[model samples]
Target: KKVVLSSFSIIGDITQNIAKDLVTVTTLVEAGNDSHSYQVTSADAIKIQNADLILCNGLHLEETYMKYFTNLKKGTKIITVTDGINPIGVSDSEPNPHAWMSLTNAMIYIENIRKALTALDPSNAKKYELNAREYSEKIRNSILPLKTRIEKVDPEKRWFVTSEGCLVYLAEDFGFKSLYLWPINSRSPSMMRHAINQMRSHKIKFIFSESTNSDQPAKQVAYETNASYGGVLYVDSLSKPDGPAPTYLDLLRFSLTKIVDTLF
Candidate 1:
């Protein structure tokens, strides 16, 4: 079987959904790890050398692991799943890389993975298309109501406060604004104060942090506002198979459902 190396666990599941029966998918960053702070290893180099194709969530999300792509085995093909999407920017020059947070963008990632697989192994193109379509449909059916649910909230009151800024794509897609203490992995006190005030002004019931990050920052915001510490958001990585968000579909539903159930 062909081997496809994914940059992280979320991307790994996305690849597995499309490549089932056609290719063996491997992940560089395992479940529950932070891909942003990932470090390369000799073991990773071996996987890169062995993989027939590489599927990464680009927009600079895997900078730590991607820099080593230069050392990849010759003839190993590569594809950035975030290709063709104009990235949301944190600053004038830095683009937010968690585009997969949007179920819509995740559909794009699924399509990109299908195209990459089809091009790599033309004989199995139809199987890849079948798997991609089925997987994407499942996700679409699950999250379509999420879009409508958030649309009913007053736009100005849609404040999604988190410990990390990585959930911007989800916030934007659902008509909520992103408020985080960590902007691209650095804690900003100014933003912290701003987030607290927004929560108070809107009477948002909860503040959140991702499973991969410490919940303290969110707790602090919750303490400062009229809100409570809601729960962990699963934007950065998937949980273990038995955990709350083992799959990409589970992650979206769990996170979105938790946010709405706790806040509104």
Candidate 2:
């Protein structure tokens, strides 16, 4: 079986669902780890060199690991799943790389994975397409109920307050105004103050943090703003097998349920 290397667990889950028994899927980063700050080791380089095909989130999400790909063996195919989607920006200079946070953008990733897998192993194209369709439908079904829950949230109180502004696409899709501590992973007192000011100005009642990041900043924001710290929402990474968001679908459901439950 051909070996497929994915940059992280979320992408690995998608690739495994599509590749199934046809290919072996391995992730460079473990679950519940932050991909942005991940350090690549010598062993990881060997995995990249040995992989038949490498799947990455792209859009600078894998900044640290991407440098190694520059010197990979010839004929190694690296496919970026976020290539064609319209990206949301953190600033004019930096585009948000967390496109998979939105279910709609995730469908695009699924299609990209399907096409890339078929291109790499055309003999199993029919099987890959069938698996992709089934997986896509499952994701779509999972999102429907979440959308209904979002619709019930009071439009005026639809605020998604979090530590990092990673849910730009999700907030847009679900009709929530995003209030975050810092634009990216880099945090500061000024940024936190600005976020706290925004929360107070918008009357944001709950603040959230991601499972992969520290909740202390968010907790501080909640304390200052007199808002409840809703809970940690999963993004950038998935939870462990025994945790709330082990799979992509579970992550979406868990995040949406938490957001809606807290806000409403």
TM-score on alpha carbons, each prediction: 0.94, 0.95
Please give the CA lDDT of all the candidate structures: 0.83, 0.85
Model 2: CA > 4 A from native: none
Model 2, total clashes:
0
* Candidate 1 Cα outliers beyond 4 Å, as residue runs: none
The alpha-carbon RMSD values of the candidates against the true structure, listed in the order shown, are 1.6, 1.4
Per residue, candidate 2 scores C-alpha lDDT tens digits across 1-264 of: 788899999999999899997988888987966788887888888888878889999888888768877677677788999978887888667778878888788788899999999998999999999999999999989987878877887778888888988788898877778878877774777888888888888888998998867899889889999999988898877898999999988888899888878866
Residue-wise C-alpha lDDT for candidate 1, range 143-175, written one tens digit per residue: 888766766777666777778787788877776
> What lDDT is reached at residue 74 by model 2?
75
Clashes of each: 0, 0
Distance (Å) between predicted and true CA of 128, model 1? Answer: 1.1
